[PDB]
Amino acid sequence: WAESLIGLHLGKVALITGGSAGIGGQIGRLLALSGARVMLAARDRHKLEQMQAMIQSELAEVGYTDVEDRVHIAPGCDVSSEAQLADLVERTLSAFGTVDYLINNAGIAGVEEMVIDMPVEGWRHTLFANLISNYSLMRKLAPLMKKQGSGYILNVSSYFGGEKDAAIPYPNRADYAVSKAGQRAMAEVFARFLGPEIQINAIAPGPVEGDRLRGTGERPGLFARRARLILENKRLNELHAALIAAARTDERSMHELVELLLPNDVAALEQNPAAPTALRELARRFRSEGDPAASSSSALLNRSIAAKLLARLHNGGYVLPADIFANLPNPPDPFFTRAQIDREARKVRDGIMGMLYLQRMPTEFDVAMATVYYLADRNVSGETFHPSGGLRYERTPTGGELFGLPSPERLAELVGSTVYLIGEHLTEHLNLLARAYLERYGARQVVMIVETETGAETMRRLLHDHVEAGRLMTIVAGDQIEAAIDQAITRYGRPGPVVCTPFRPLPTVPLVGRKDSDWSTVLSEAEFAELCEHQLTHHFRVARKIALSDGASLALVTPETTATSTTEQFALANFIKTTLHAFTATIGVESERTAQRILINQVDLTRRARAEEPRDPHERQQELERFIEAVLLVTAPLPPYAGRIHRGRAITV
Amino acid sequence: WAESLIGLHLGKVALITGGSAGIGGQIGRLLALSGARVMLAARDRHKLEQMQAMIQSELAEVGYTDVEDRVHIAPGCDVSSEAQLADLVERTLSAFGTVDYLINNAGIAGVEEMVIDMPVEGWRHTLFANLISNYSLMRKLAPLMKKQGSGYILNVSSYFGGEKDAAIPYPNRADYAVSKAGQRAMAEVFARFLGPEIQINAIAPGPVEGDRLRGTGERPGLFARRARLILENKRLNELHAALIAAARTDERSMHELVELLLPNDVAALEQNPAAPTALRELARRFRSEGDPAASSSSALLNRSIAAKLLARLHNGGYVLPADIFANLPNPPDPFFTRAQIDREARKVRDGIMGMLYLQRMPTEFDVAMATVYYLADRNVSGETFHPSGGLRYERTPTGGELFGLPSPERLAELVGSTVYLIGEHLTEHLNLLARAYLERYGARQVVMIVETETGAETMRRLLHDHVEAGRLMTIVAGDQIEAAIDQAITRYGRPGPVVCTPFRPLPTVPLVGRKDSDWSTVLSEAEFAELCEHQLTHHFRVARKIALSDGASLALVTPETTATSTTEQFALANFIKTTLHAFTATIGVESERTAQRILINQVDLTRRARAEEPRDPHERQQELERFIEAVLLVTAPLPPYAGRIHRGRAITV
Ligand SMILES: NC(=O)c1ccc[n+]([C@@H]2O[C@H](COP(=O)([O-])OP(=O)(O)OC[C@H]3O[C@@H](n4cnc5c(N)ncnc54)[C@H](OP(=O)(O)O)[C@@H]3O)[C@@H](O)[C@H]2O)c1
């Protein structure tokens, strides 16, 4: 079977991250069988040694000589660590010389929580492991590839990273979806700069049969974990919604309502006459729909669900002691039975198998085979190859350019509203937007949340009249946007419209170096992380906080490009736009599954080509008015199908 | 080099259309080298015999025995002929038994004219050759593939067929672009029905080095023909624009103005004091920018350009004798010099090489190699594989769902306008639209163009009040829509808004048969041609006529899908929507290159999933109002960047 591989990649040097098991292990195996010298990078030394011995033994069997020179390993390499990425390149370069193929395969599952329960550091770690590492390794390897005249960068993305002009929601996986979308976006925008010497593509497999999805006897896989999370998330969401519902119609504090959960007894809560109807109906549901052998049928929660519930409540402005669940009676194992988890795990697998046009998943060998043949194609760059797939899953087309003004019914709902505007760099857009809300649509007040004092002063001066009339309030957020939103809520009340623009502009730096250059001026590994911080994480932090604020409409705004903007700014802007679509679509679906009525849409200020951009002051004026219309179209509340249309969507100004 | 191919497709039977040269010839060659038995279909017997002898000789060299049983030919097979497609299947089935791989490779360049100069029969021929043939062959071969448990349908589409959620304009190639887009759309929508047994994908190469693009010594290729057409089209467009411009400010008839072109002397026209300034300035331009060795620098036109100019004028309502150019002095060869054509051909190739991220084109061998490896992948269906490419060309994202009402300035322009509504089946949409234009936006009159008398009576009854007040006029078009538009122009005046809805609904028929069934009920080859006639050609015919009507705004409306609609209707509706986007985007760009100020946009009534569709009477009412807003957003005229935004675009209702 390996006879079709001999000579296919002979003379090539390949670097495979996550090369000790899964898809990566197979790509490394098949590349070695194809004649390539391979370096396998992963954390565990033992797994890396096992795979190396397995590949070397196989190479010897087909006829190869000095097989130890063909398969090298790089243990203790965590792709989320920059230092480890620098040590990997040096170890690979010393071992084999220049790298021809960079296989950015490593990809952690990530946080596996809804955005509202996703720690900011967890989101950051996934971006570093899955996305920032891809740029870091390309940045260290592309100068030597351009010098020798050839090279290939392959990013192992996913079907759940979406496609060129459509976003795919991936609930409970926003960090993951974004990182996969960014890997694809990198191939799409860097191809024009990396060519003619270097090819850059993404592979986006659909679900694959293997240990990641199926799991081992010792450790549960993606399906079993997703099954356990479905059950745990269901308990968290139901408890949270019932507490928010009861709080509306009950005069007791959230603290007093949470105190009713403390005996942690489903039966005692159901028959408690002093408890609100929403909590009693919830207890009845927990015992009625539950498994009698599961302690989740007799106990309300466990220490883990209690901590997530507490953080949701704290993040949503409710005042509760941090020790409220300290003496919570711990339910006896199992909280959810193996029967409940298996039924849920079977539903996940059956649902996926149903979505697949071919009603079958490829093996890791199959995906690696399609990839190794794909790597032989020298005439394709900036593409996303789908080695498996074709799924019935819903996609959200992005890039609607043709739109108009929202209805007068929706506009009259803006009268007397509280507007939050977040930004710094886009002073013109922020000034015009604050004025449109206050002067045209009679909003009660605008809270201008900036990053710095210099930004606050610039906005206060531009809006001097509204500042004088107590209509425009300014808050300096710094790198504490969550505390800044809390300040705005406490002092000026909860918002209706929320317009989140980036604080920072896109950098004006080269994306590739000249053939004989040192690449010293080229966008660094640290600057690429900052780009993701300022242009992705910024929006995620605001969305995480605003998704717990009832009655809010959030517009996530992407960077601005002009006829003046550098070609590098166009690339980076298009990279962001695409990557943030994955986030916007994912959180849009997650928001449906919450108690809070919250709309989240994306407004794109960036365009693919310079030819589309305005060229005169009249064409600029049309653009700025189009921006206001786009924001109003997504921020004006829907007065009591239309909800599906007005969420996780993105329009191009 | 062929050692990597041995056994890759061993035991497989492949049918390759256009298998005697180009990409198809190489796919057949490489599939045979891979162990497949191949049938090559094309028109010329000699070319087919040459290729067969070449492949058989090669097979013998690598070791194969009885090579004559491995390579068969099917001469005199024109894919545009249904009879020839039936004879091909029977000849292939008798020769080898069941076909595993259907390679729908044949693809004619087509008419190679702007839509306004494209004969309706030429457009039809391209659809038959390039698109209808793909369904026809699949329809005859899929029953036997489903029976044996396996099969593969591969449509050789193009980069110029666009992508899942973005259309790519291909000026002067609308028939071609549409056929390529339809080949991709077929793979996208039929995969769910054809699985698990049958895979259906498209390949979409970017430009490929070969005889199609480069040409032979005897016959010019795509580039040289495109160079010649650029020059000929430039002469046609400039002459046409100057005649339309002069007609505006001159009281002479179009007949009298065309009479000034009859001496066919550039110098005599320039210095003719009696000639209009636009024609004199045109003559000066023809000699000033021309090559002195070309007769196009001293003569205005030739018999070929004169006939195209005459048909444009006739199709635009100008009255001229059919014999007006009968005695036109024929210019001496060359009309355009080899120098002019070569310069133009070099500009085409350099422009394409510039657009390519890799700045190189693959060979036909390279594309066939990537395809033959791709065919080995058993786990992918409903996809478009790009074996080459990555181009800087502009794309038009489709699927904008979020939009609103147009500006009050644009709406007041509708006051006193003449509206043309084209349709039959969608009585509710036509009644509500006619009423919105007349009652809400004060249009002077609505001309309701239907297909049949039964349709006219249904509309006249629904709009009884407007019919009584002389506000609603009805015309029965039958299969003579061009003559029906002429009638409306002569009798009621030229239109402002033009809303083109399909006359016919989508069929309610199976798209695949049961494993053991005869497939007798499945959408026939003739019904698929009718689907293209009613749902594609219908719009093309209207657009071709309306693109010559100054001040018109054309909205091309795609079929309606509901929560009631069959799953087969959803597939076919999504097939149309995608295929028509290629047309809409192409004609939008061509319209910029014309004298007439004409806007052309697409309004989609169809949606991908049933889940998106309304479920109650209130959700239906929102949908119908969204339809009116969408049509107004694209039909309200732009009062004197914004033109680029308002053209070749498509929104989803
Ligand atoms: N499986 C699917 O269904 C599927 C579908 C679409 C896309 N993908 C993508 O395909 C790629 C490979 O996935 P897979 O299914 O093969 O996953 P996997 O089984 O989790 O990958 C295991 C490999 O990754 C390494 N690894 C894990 N965490 C790492 C880290 N922090 N740093 C470095 N190496 C690390 C492992 O070794 P150590 O743990 O010792 O480091 C091992 O070598 C990923 O990018 C994933 O997103 C997978």
Ligand SMILES: NC(=O)c1ccc[n+]([C@@H]2O[C@H](COP(=O)([O-])OP(=O)(O)OC[C@H]3O[C@@H](n4cnc5c(N)ncnc54)[C@H](OP(=O)(O)O)[C@@H]3O)[C@@H](O)[C@H]2O)c1
């Ligand atoms: N070349 C490119 O740059 C490019 C790029 C993207 C996509 N494609 C697509 O790739 C496919 C093959 O293109 P190519 O470049 O190989 O074209 P090509 O060189 O024109 O194809 C020649 C082959 O097609 C046959 N053929 C032509 N007209 C036919 C007809 N009416 N019926 C049956 N066979 C016919 C020819 O034989 P006879 O004339 O004797 O019949 C010969 O076998 C097409 O579908 C095309 O759209 C090509």
